[PDB]
Design a protein around this nucleic acid. Structure first.
Ligand SMILES: [Mg+2]
Ligand SMILES: [Mg+2]
Ligand SMILES: [Mg+2]
Ligand SMILES: [Mg+2]
Ligand SMILES: [Mg+2]
Ligand SMILES: [Mg+2]
Ligand SMILES: [Mg+2]
Ligand SMILES: [Mg+2]
Ligand SMILES: [Mg+2]
Ligand SMILES: [Mg+2]
Ligand SMILES: [Mg+2]
Ligand SMILES: [Mg+2]
Ligand SMILES: [Mg+2]
Ligand SMILES: [Mg+2]
Lengths: 266, 73, 125, 293, 196, 123, 184, 49, 98
RNA sequence: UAUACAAUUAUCAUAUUAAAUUGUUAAGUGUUGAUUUAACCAAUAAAAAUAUAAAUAAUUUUUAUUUGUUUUUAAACACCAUUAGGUA
RNA sequence: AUUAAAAAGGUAUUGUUGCCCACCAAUUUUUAUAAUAAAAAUAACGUGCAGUAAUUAAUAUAUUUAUAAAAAUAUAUUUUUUUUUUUU
């Protein structure tokens, strides 16, 4: 048993039944947390995108008008279907209705022998860019074989969440510490807290917790770069050895040692 | 000659369902109890009078995706 | 049968002139691009099937609603009346129609007959 | 240890593993804590001396405003308002990009009865149904989008064509007059030394060799150019660049470096056109047979 | 009961007749094998025989998918690093740490971003194992001989065109310029094989 | 959990008929008299009501019923059968296991091989 | 002897060897030139070159040219290699779609998370966190913010990496861009 | 969701009714960024009220 | 015609020819034509924006590009080669007899 | 010594209802020389792109017809031998 | 203050110190006797190292070559190991 698209063993979905958001959240629902709740509304019935090629091999590409100009005398319209070198795209890259492929290879042939199209290169390459669907990294086409774009938008939205989190942690921080400028000796302090916590500790005001501190700072001026004269020992004339340097013991249990690591080049 | 690793334990993709299908157990248990020498389990005491649905057939036996096999699913 | 070109199997339930599907010289099948809707690429297409399942619909009767006037006024289009249904309909199969064998299989190459797919050109109209 | 390399430092258990955490580092100076606490507290009060929403709102006194909302004018308005906002929003949370586009369009727009044709009329016009769906611009069409030579090089009787050919084990450079006459000979990775009796073939066609060759060639190219021009009476005395067309062949490593050695000459040579001539084999005579086939 | 139905006391429970003649198959599938690890043929993760399979060929590129650690790998901040590089190269009289601040901000975020992507990808490995992978049980689709039947269908066609004769036959390759080097009366282009 | 969440439209699960089906099958999964797979295929293939789908067109659009009746019945059965020593545990576990799966991608579908007991299993 | 232009020995430099065709201005390469780029004023030709090369490499043209222009291979090995390439492609596509079908689910769970943040802090607040100018008194603040966004959106030229060509000993593949072994 | 202003900013005029949304935007304007997970956390911050 | 004048002049300088301009025709007034001018200049503005930013000064950019090309060169040189590339024919024959 | 193939799917040599066959294009000189190769040796180097429809299905072609061997190098590549040539 | 994980083949069968391949002697036995008949049994001696993705991957056809396995080239091909651009 295989799904057609990627061979999945299930039919893809997010939610199915009318109740599930309710039943999952039920204690929240009796409580009444869920009254203005926009998460249980927006995504409640939300299902996956259709990621499918409606044309696996495009019989749609090109639209009808274009066929008219797929003849030998339209260098431009030849060019919108080729690479920048003038070669055709492989079928599984840019799929074309077989009519278009026939007309196109014939066209380029004719055009070439008549001198109306160059034997290599695409002379209209820049002009044709309007006709190609140039896809902005900023929009998202739910159907792509691009794995980069998907993860890029995932990144984007997740970071848009992280921003919020950070904004509201620094805000409440600012209010806990700004309360001190609001109330100096107003309250919130226990006697036992006066006993235990008013002493210097790693949580309170440690000195430094790490090796290689900065001590002795001074205003002295920069020196000339490379004040040091090259040593008497020449490092240049020495050849670097890696593999045979020490002696090793092989953990190979059985069989001939792999010919690609050693015994091959290069 | 390299092959996919688990081909030794590879399931029969056509027939692995047969063993588990309700009708089979109905028949087998049916002629087991008939003997007189087997105490019928209670599920049999029940589905004895409510035998399962007739025309639900797997996709393995019928090779049609478009066949809606189950009244339920 | 493990022999290549014999993979299509023994099907009797086809409409062809041999019960051995792989001797049939009419419709050569396409294992890579076929069988989205029919399951396996061997089996007959939805419109050519001569055997029918219990819970699956059978063929639509072609027309080529006015005649339901006696019926339920709300009753819409009957599921089995279709405008366009062709029992003889050539499905595009690459090894037949686009045949790359005599070439090096570079992007434009292979011989193509256009008589299969209806022309999407504007030239006709 | 013995005839084997020393383990990296991290492969030994912690050097101070037996010293308690309160000892590394010691938090000493506790005596002062309290002192500074008092101090800081004191300072806060000092900083006040330098320096130095619960308005009761009765719900009965608002009544006039509430009565304004019972009028069918204001509810006609809330209806229009809510029916304009009821179309399905694709916005979701506030987006920076779309805001920017929006306001940039507002800056750009701030810088800025006849009988309806029936279905029967458009039944009779076959053309119109094809105009509505057409990709082709209707109106005067820009000519620069037609002519063959629009996007293409435009040369001049004074131009120098620099050929950088990267090969697998070699790289070389030449220069040519527009009229086809050769300027200097071909400086080659094997011509300059730089190749044999040495490090190896693997590095022979490398990037840095191509750089060495191109940068050695341009150096020798300038004076001879000024002489070939002095011969016809074109002085090019000062403040001039050579207008250059860089033609590059080969898709091999030695290409990269080559063009770099042109780019650092940008104060001498001015590149108008970068066009690569790389042969493509549709099919042709047999190439030499390799090992496997 | 206390464990799986496909695994009994001594190893994988031997259903087909292949298991009874060859019962090494029950207890050893490789060097990633443990005893709880029988019947689950995939072994743990980061472990030998942990790789999920897709139509029989194992999935060894996972990091390359989410664009962590690949040559095609997704880059978070470019505009920043370029901006800062430009600053460094232009002049030495003015030094801009403003650029280095925008950049180090960018990086500071990037860390958490990456841990997120990695986590989501491990969840993908789990999902892929549950709902997609066949656990190396189906025949490879990824090399041309696996598709032999397909090619056969094409050879058959070129045979029926030839009056059902030459199977697997192709036109004789001629010469680089066979057409213009040959005199009248000799074939100047390669014919159908049956036509010879 | 499977009988509750893995089945579109298992009829009205309050009705004594379908309820008894479920009860019996449950007591047969406990005490090992049946395979889980067999009892599941028994449940979904059990006899409900004539012209089932065409009565289903009078309630459901895409054939997905509401899941409350299913869970209330499935807890009821475990309570009336003596399944647990402490009464609450039945309901709690049946509830909890559903809530955890709610977050998973394609949560209520399952690959047919791994869904139940079979030769090869998941870790 | 006569060699093609993509041949190893093509343009030789020796005492006997002499290059063929008009070699400058309007030249031997006249209609044979695969790419042409007018250099934009104040643009180093290194960006131009790395753009061209990235293009050719990603679309597997430089692959093809390197491959065919070095050795002869029979039409069977060419077919085997090309269809193998294409079927490996097919497989990895069917992997990508699975990954993507999952990542859209992940992205959904994220957007959902964002919704929950919305009804914890209220919509407007969340919008504030996202850079909404509610603090913009006058247009000058707006133009500062949008000047910031302008200076972000402007794209610095991307320097896209081109994998080096690996020269091996007898050259089983001159398509070699990595040190991995290949099936010829 | 219906009747939910998606683009709302803090310099928007305060809505008239009492909803989790309207009250939370209001509270943002009044207290600044003070937000508490639950009511006993607020009673924690005020300490003895 | 103006697209070809450069190359015609460059090939045969002695040849005398004129740039040939079409006969002009004006729609509406010089006003609608000035508006066409605003439209073409605005399209050249959106395209001047989209095309390339290119920083400011050329040499400052070239320095950076060449730097990063160099750094990639020497992060490359640290990759393990294949055994076969590394070893001579000496040890090949040694392992052969072995 | 006699004493029961298959006929639903079986890889080495007894083919058989099939639409082909024919197309005259490309490419070539400036000058003083280390190209190719892991390595040797001979020694001008550039190149040869276009065709669908249509042909009806079966019943006496089995001595008939048919399955990559091909004039012309004064044209190359390629391959074989090694500077003399063979072949293409 | 310069780290490792996840994909892989066996003509062997406690498994490469594993097996095997031809020529090169004796003999045994059948015959349709081609440099020196053919074929089959076979446990010496002497060459090597052909094969088990096996030290330039193998397999089939074709043509050439030859101490012996075999080797070179021309086509098909995996009973060889995979590396993967849906218009940039
Ligand atoms: Mg093998
Ligand atoms: Mg194995
Ligand atoms: Mg393994
Ligand atoms: Mg000769
Ligand atoms: Mg026979
Ligand atoms: Mg005898
Ligand atoms: Mg004999
Ligand atoms: Mg050997
Ligand atoms: Mg061999
Ligand atoms: Mg070998
Ligand atoms: Mg052989
Ligand atoms: Mg020999
Ligand atoms: Mg042989
Ligand atoms: Mg061979």
């Amino acid at each position: 048993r295989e799904g057609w698209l990627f061979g999945q063993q299930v039919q893809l979905h997010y939610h199915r039944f009318p109740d599930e958001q309710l039943i999952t959240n039920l204690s929240r629902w009796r409580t009444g947390e869920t009254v203005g709740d926009i998460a249980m509304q927006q995504f409640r019935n939300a299902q996956p995108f259709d990621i499918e090629d409606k044309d696996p091999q495009g019989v749609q590409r090109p639209s009808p008008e274009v066929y008219m100009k797929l003849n030998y005398k339209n260098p431009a319209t030849i060019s919108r279907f080729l690479t920048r070198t003038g070669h055709m795209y492989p079928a599984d890259i840019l799929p074309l209705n077989p009519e278009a492929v026939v007309k196109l290879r014939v066209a380029k042939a004719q055009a070439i022998r008549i001198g109306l199209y160059p034997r290599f290169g695409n002379p209209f390459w820049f002009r044709s860019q309007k006709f190609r669907p140039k896809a902005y990294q900023e929009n998202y086409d739910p159907t792509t074989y691009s794995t980069k774009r998907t993860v890029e938008h995932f990144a984007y939205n997740w970071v848009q969440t992280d921003r919020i989190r950070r904004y509201f942690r620094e805000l409440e921080a600012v209010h806990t510490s700004g309360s001190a400028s609001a109330r100096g000796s107003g309250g919130g302090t226990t006697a036992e807290h006066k006993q235990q916590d008013q002493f210097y500790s790693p949580e309170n005001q440690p000195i430094s917790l790490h090796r290689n501190n900065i001590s002795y700072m001074e205003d002295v001026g920069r020196s000339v770069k490379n004040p040091t004269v090259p040593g008497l020992m020449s490092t240049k004339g020495m050849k670097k050895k890696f593999h045979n340097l020490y002696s090793s013991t092989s953990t190979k249990r059985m069989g001939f040692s792999n010919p690609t690591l050693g015994i091959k080049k290069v | 000659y390299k092959m996919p690793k688990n081909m030794g334990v590879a399931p029969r993709f056509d027939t692995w369902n047969e063993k588990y299908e309700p009708w089979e157990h109905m028949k087998r248990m049916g002629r087991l109890v008939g003997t007189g020498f087997y105490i019928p389990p209670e599920w049999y005491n029940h589905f004895r009078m409510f035998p399962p649905i007739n025309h639900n057939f797997q996709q393995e036996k019928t090779l049609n995706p478009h066949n809606a096999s189950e009244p339920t699913q | 049968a493990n022999h290549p070109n014999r993979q299509s199997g023994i099907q009797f339930l086809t409409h062809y002139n041999t019960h051995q599907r792989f001797r049939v010289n009419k419709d050569y099948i396409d294992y890579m691009h076929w069988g989205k809707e029919q399951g396996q690429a061997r089996l007959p297409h939805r419109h050519q099937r001569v055997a029918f399942d219990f819970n699956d619909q059978l063929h639509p009767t072609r027309i080529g609603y006015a005649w339901f006037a006696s019926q339920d006024p709300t009753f819409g289009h009957h599921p089995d009346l279709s405008s366009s249904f062709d029992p003889n309909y050539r499905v595009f199969s690459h090894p037949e129609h686009w045949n790359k064998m005599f070439t090096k299989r570079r992007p434009g190459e292979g011989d193509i007959d256009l008589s299969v797919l209806p022309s999407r050109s504007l030239l006709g109209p | 240890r013995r005839g084997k390399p020393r383990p990296r430092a991290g492969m030994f258990p912690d050097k101070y593993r037996r010293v308690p955490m309160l000892l590394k580092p010691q938090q000493g100076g506790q005596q002062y804590f309290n002192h500074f606490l008092i101090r800081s507290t004191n300072d806060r009060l000092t900083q006040q001396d330098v320096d130095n929403f619960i308005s009761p709102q009765l719900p009965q006194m608002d009544w006039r405003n509430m009565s304004a909302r019972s009028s069918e004018e204001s509810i006609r308005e809330e209806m229009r308002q809510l029916a304009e906002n009821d179309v399905m929003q694709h916005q979701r949370v506030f987006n920076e990009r779309m805001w920017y586009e929006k306001e940039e369009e507002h800056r750009m727009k701030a810088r800025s009865p006849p009988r309806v044709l029936g279905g029967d009329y458009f039944k009779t016009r076959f053309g119109y149904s094809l105009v509505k769906n057409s990709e082709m611009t209707q109106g005067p069409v820009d000519y620069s989008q037609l002519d063959m030579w629009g996007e293409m090089p435009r040369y001049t009787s004074d131009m120098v064509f620099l050929y950088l050919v990267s090969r697998r084990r070699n790289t070389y450079a030449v220069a040519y007059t527009y009229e086809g006459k050769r300027i200097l000979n071909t400086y080659t990775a094997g011509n300059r030394g730089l190749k044999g009796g040495d490090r190896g073939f693997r590095s022979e066609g490398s990037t840095d060799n191509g750089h060495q060759v191109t940068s050695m060639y341009l150096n020798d190219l300038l004076p001879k150019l000024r002489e070939m021009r002095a011969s016809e009476g074109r002085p090019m005395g000062r403040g001039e660049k050579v207008e250059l067309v860089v033609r590059v062949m080969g898709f091999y490593n030695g290409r990269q470096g080559a063009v770099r050695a042109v780019q650092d000459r940008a104060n001498e040579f001015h590149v108008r056109y970068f066009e690569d001539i790389t042969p493509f084999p549709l099919n042709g005579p047999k190439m030499p047979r390799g090992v496997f086939k | 009961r206390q464990h799986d139905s496909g695994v009994n006391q001594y190893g994988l429970k031997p259903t087909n007749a292949y298991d009874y003649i060859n019962p090494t198959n029950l207890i050893n599938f490789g060097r990633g094998t443990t005893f709880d690890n029988l019947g689950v043929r995939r072994a743990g993760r980061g472990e030998i025989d942990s790789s999920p399979s897709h139509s029989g060929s194992p999935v060894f590129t996972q990091a390359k998918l989410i664009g962590l650690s690949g040559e095609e790998q997704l880059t978070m901040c470019q505009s920043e690093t370029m901006a800062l590089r430009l600053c460094m190269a232009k002049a030495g009289k003015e030094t801009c740490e403003r650029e280095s601040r925008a950049l180090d901000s960018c990086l500071g975020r990037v860390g958490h971003l990456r841990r997120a992507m990695s986590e989501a990808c491990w969840e993908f490995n789990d999902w892929f194992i549950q709902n997609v992978s066949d656990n190396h049980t189906k025949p490879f689709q990824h090399r041309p001989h696996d598709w032999r039947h397909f090619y056969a269908q094409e050879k058959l066609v070129r045979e029926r065109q030839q009056n059902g004769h030459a199977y697997g036959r192709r036109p004789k390759q001629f010469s680089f310029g066979a057409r213009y080097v040959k005199t009248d009366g000799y074939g100047k282009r390669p014919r159908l094989p049956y036509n010879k | 959990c499977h009988t509750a969440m893995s089945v579109l439209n298992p009829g009205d699960m309050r009705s004594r008929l379908i309820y008894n089906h479920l009860r019996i099958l449950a007591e047969s999964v406990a005490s090992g008299e049946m395979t889980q797979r067999t009892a599941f295929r028994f449940f979904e293939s059990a006899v409900r009501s004539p012209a089932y789908r065409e009565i289903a067109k009078r309630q459901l659009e895409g054939g997905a019923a509401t899941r409350l009746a299913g869970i209330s019945a499935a807890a009821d059965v475990m309570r009336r059968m003596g399944l647990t020593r402490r009464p609450m545990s039945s309901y709690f576990e049946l509830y909890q296991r559903i809530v955890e799966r709610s977050e998973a991608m394609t949560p209520w579908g399952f690959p047919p091989l791994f869904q139940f007991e079979e030769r090869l299993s998941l870790e | 002897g006569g060699y093609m232009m993509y041949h190893r020995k093509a343009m030789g430099t020796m005492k006997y060897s002499k290059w063929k065709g008009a070699h400058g201005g309007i030249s031997h390469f006249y209609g044979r030139t695969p790419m042409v780029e007018e250099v934009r004023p104040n643009e180093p030709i290194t960006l131009v070159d790395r753009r061209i090369m990235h293009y050719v490499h990603h679309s597997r043209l430089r692959h093809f040219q390197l491959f065919r222009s070095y050795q002869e291979k029979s039409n069977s090995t060419e077919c085997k290699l090309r269809e193998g390439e294409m079927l490996r492609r097919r497989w990895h596509r069917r992997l990508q779609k699975s990954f993507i079908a999952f990542m859209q689910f992940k992205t959904m769970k994220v957007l959902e998370d964002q919704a929950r943040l919305v009804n914890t802090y209220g919509q407007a607040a969340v919008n504030a966190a996202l850079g909404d100018p509610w603090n913009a008194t006058d247009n000058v603040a707006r133009e500062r913010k949008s000047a910031a966004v302008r200076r972000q959106v402007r794209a610095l030229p991307m320097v896209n990496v081109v994998p080096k060509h690996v020269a091996t000993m007898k050259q089983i593949h001159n398509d070699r861009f990595n040190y991995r072994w290949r099936v010829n | 969701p219906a009747e939910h202003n998606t683009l709302s900013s803090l310099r928007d005029e305060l809505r008239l009714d009492l909803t989790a949304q309207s009250l939370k935007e209001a509270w943002m304007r009044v207290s600044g960024g003070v937000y508490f997970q639950s009511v006993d956390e607020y009673y924690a911050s005020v300490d003895g009220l | 015609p103006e697209s070809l004048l450069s190359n015609h002049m460059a090939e045969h300088p002695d040849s005398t020819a004129k740039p040939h301009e079409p006969h002009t025709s004006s729609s509406i007034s010089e006003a609608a034509a000035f508006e066409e001018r605003m439209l073409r200049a605005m399209v050249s503005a959106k395209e001047e924006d989209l095309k390339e930013w290119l920083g400011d000064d050329s040499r400052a950019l070239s320095e950076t590009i060449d730097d990063i090309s160099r750094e990639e060169e020497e992060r490359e040189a640290d990759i393990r080669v294949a055994r076969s590339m590394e070893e001579t024919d000496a040890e090949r024959e040694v392992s052969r007899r072995a």
